[PDB]
Amino acid sequence: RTTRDDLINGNSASCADVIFIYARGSTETGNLGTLGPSIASNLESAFGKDGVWIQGVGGAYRATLGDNALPRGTSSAAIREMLGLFQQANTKCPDATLIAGGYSQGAALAAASIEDLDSAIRDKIAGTVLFGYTKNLQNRGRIPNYPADRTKVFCNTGDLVCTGSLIVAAPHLAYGPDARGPAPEFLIEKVRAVRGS
């Protein structure tokens, strides 16, 4: 449900084939918040419960609203926590395909972490989904250093954070349908593109 630590808890002798690392929005609970559980259930349907590990970004990422105003759209402590999880995935399961996502502050966190990542680990992330991306205008709909064909941004009309503001309006809270269908669809397609099946 809202906390999943499958990568931290998982046995290195029985690594999943796919590892999903997700950062929640501001003030959301657990480490998956409101959208992460919907994406997770559809990934487990596609790959099986033993086939995918779901890992939210917890620890030092407190998802504090005020940190949206900091230079990268989140805190340096939160970026170190998400980088640490990508590096743990790479060490624990070197053959797994990675996928990532984030909502709102979590989308800025996912973009900042991927930008800073060692390229050999960044290149293992087959697809990333971003909802209510707070750096959408500033980054021109891209994650720095990461290919456009592996990125999918869900930015609703009237969601002001997608257009350079930090005002929260009703369209910012309306990504439930996307998390239920097109966002897991995109991640599954990008994993199968490189792993076959």
Curated annotation (Swiss-Prot):
Temperature-dependence annotation: Optimum temperature is below 30 degrees Celsius. Optimum temperature is 30-40 degrees Celsius.
UniProt enzyme class: hydrolase
Domain of life: Eukaryota
Active site residues per record: S104, D159, H172
InterPro entries tied to this protein: AB_hydrolase_fold (IPR029058), Cutinase/axe (IPR000675), CUTINASE_1 (IPR043580), CUTINASE_2 (IPR043579), Cutinase_monf (IPR011150)
UniProt key word Secreted: yes
Family statement: Belongs to the cutinase family.
PANTHER family in UniProt: CUTINASE 1-RELATED, CUTINASE 2-RELATED
Name by which UniProt lists this protein: Cutinase 1
Record organism: Fusarium vanettenii
Gene this protein is translated from: CUT1
